[PDB]
Ligand binder design. Structure first.
Ligand SMILES: *[C@@H]1O[C@H](CO)[C@@H](O[C@@H]2O[C@H](CO)[C@@H](O[C@@H]3O[C@H](CO)[C@@H](O)[C@H](O)[C@@H]3O)[C@H](O)[C@H]2NC(C)=O)[C@H](O)[C@H]1NC(C)=O
Ligand SMILES: *[C@@H]1O[C@H](CO)[C@@H](O)[C@H](O)[C@H]1NC(C)=O
Ligand SMILES: *[C@@H]1O[C@H](CO)[C@@H](O)[C@H](O)[C@H]1NC(C)=O
Lengths: 124, 49, 106
C-alpha cells in the first residue's frame, strides 16, 4: 500500500495539465478510487470517483466537463487531465482509495477510504 | 529491516518467507514466539500444564 | 444532502474526554464515517458505519448515531491529537464531506 502522484506545482489560469497518480502493493482491480483536494483553510472537496471496472465515472458540477479522470489497472496508475482551470483550484491532491472489494464484473457503492497519497500541491 | 548484518549479496526486496535454522536435535521447549498482525498481537507457546 | 459539524474549533488540555458531532440533513441511518487529518500531512479513517472502528485504531475513539444526528468522541486527549476531525456520508454517490472540527492543546 503506497500512493504517489506526479505533475504538481503551478499552472497558468485556464490552461491544461496531465496530473497523475500511481499505486502499488494491494489488489488494485477490485477497489474503487477517488480524487479529493485540500484547498488552504477549507474543506476536502470531492473531485471525482471511478468504480473498479472503469465504466462508471462521476463528477461534481465544479468538476463536470472540465476534467477527465481515467484508470489504467495494468500498470496500476490513475490518470487525470485538467481543462479550463480557475484560480479556485489552488489546493493539494491526495488520490484516495476505496476499502470495499467489489468484483471486476460489478459496480456500486464507493465511499469508504483508508489510504491517501502523499499530497501534490497544485496552484492556478 | 531489523536483520543482522547480511554477508554476501543482499537486497532490500520485500521477502515472503522467513526461515530459522536450529541446532542438532534442539527443541524450543524453553520459550515463546511473537507475531504481529494488522488486527492485534499473536504469540505461540507450548506447555503440558 | 449537506453537512454541519460542531464544535467548529476548540482548545483543550491534554487528557480531556473531547466530544464532536456531525449532522447530515437527512436520515442517513448508518452510512457515516470520521477521519483524522493532520494539517500538512495525510488523513486517516477513524471510525466507519458510525459505530465500528477500523482495525488500526485504538478503542480510545468511539461514536454512534442514527438518523440525522451523529457523534464521535474520545475517552481522553493525547499530545498527538493536534489535527482536524472530518466526517463524510456515503448514502448518495454524490457525496458530501463534512464541516470539519479542530482540536488544540492548552
Ligand atoms: C518496514 O516498513 C514499514 C513501512 O512499510 C515501517 O513502518 C514503520 O514502523 C515503525 C515501527 O517499527 C512505526 O513506528 C513509529 O512511528 C513514528 C511515526 O511518526 C515514527 O516517528 C517512529 O520513528 C517509529 O517509526 C512507523 O509508524 C512505521 N512507519 C514509518 C513511515 O516509519 C517499518 O519501520 C519498516 N521496518 C521494519 C523493521 O519493519
Ligand atoms: C537498501 O536501502 C538502504 C537505504 O538507505 C541503502 O543504504 C542500501 O544500500 C540498500 N540496499 C540495497 C541492496 O538496495
Ligand atoms: C510437565 O513436564 C515436566 C517436564 O518438562 C514434568 O516434570 C511435569 O511433571 C509435567 N507435568 C506438569 C503438570 O507440569
Amino acid at each position: 500500500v503506497q500512493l504517489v502522484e506526479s505533475g504538481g506545482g503551478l499552472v497558468q489560469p485556464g490552461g491544461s495539465l496531465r496530473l497523475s497518480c500511481a499505486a502499488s502493493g494491494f489488489t488494485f482491480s477490485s477497489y474503487a478510487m477517488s480524487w479529493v483536494r485540500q484547498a488552504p483553510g477549507k474543506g476536502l472537496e470531492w473531485v471525482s470517483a471511478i468504480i473498479g471496472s472503469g465504466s462508471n465515472t462521476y463528477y461534481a458540477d465544479s468538476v463536470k466537463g472540465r476534467f477527465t479522470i481515467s484508470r489504467d489497472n495494468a500498470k496500476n496508475t490513475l490518470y487525470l487531465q485538467m481543462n479550463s482551470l480557475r484560480a479556485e483550484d489552488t489546493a493539494v491532491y491526495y488520490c484516495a482509495k476505496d476499502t470495499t472489494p467489489r468484483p471486476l464484473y460489478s459496480s456500486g457503492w464507493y465511499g469508504s477510504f483508508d489510504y491517501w497519497g502523499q499530497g501534490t500541491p497544485v496552484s492556478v | 529491516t531489523g536483520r543482522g548484518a547480511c554477508k554476501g549479496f543482499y537486497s532490500n526486496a520485500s521477502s515472503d518467507v522467513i526461515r530459522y535454522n536450529i541446532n542438532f536435535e534442539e527443541n524450543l521447549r524453553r520459550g515463546t514466539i511473537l507475531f504481529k498482525t494488522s488486527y492485534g498481537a499473536v504469540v505461540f507457546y507450548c506447555t503440558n500444564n | 444532502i449537506q453537512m454541519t459539524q460542531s464544535p467548529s474549533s476548540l482548545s483543550a488540555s491534554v487528557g480531556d474526554r473531547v466530544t464532536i458531532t456531525c449532522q447530515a440533513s437527512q436520515d442517513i441511518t448508518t452510512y457515516l464515517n470520521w477521519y483524522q487529518q493532520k494539517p500538512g500531512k495525510a488523513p486517516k479513517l477513524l471510525i466507519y458505519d458510525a459505530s465500528n472502528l477500523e482495525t488500526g485504531v485504538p478503542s480510545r475513539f468511539s461514536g454512534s448515531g442514527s438518523g440525522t444526528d451523529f457523534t464521535l468522541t474520545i475517552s481522553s486527549l493525547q499530545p498527538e491529537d493536534i489535527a482536524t476531525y472530518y466526517c463524510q456520508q456515503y448514502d448518495n454517490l454524490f457525496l458530501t464531506f463534512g464541516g470539519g472540527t479542530k482540536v488544540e492543546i492548552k
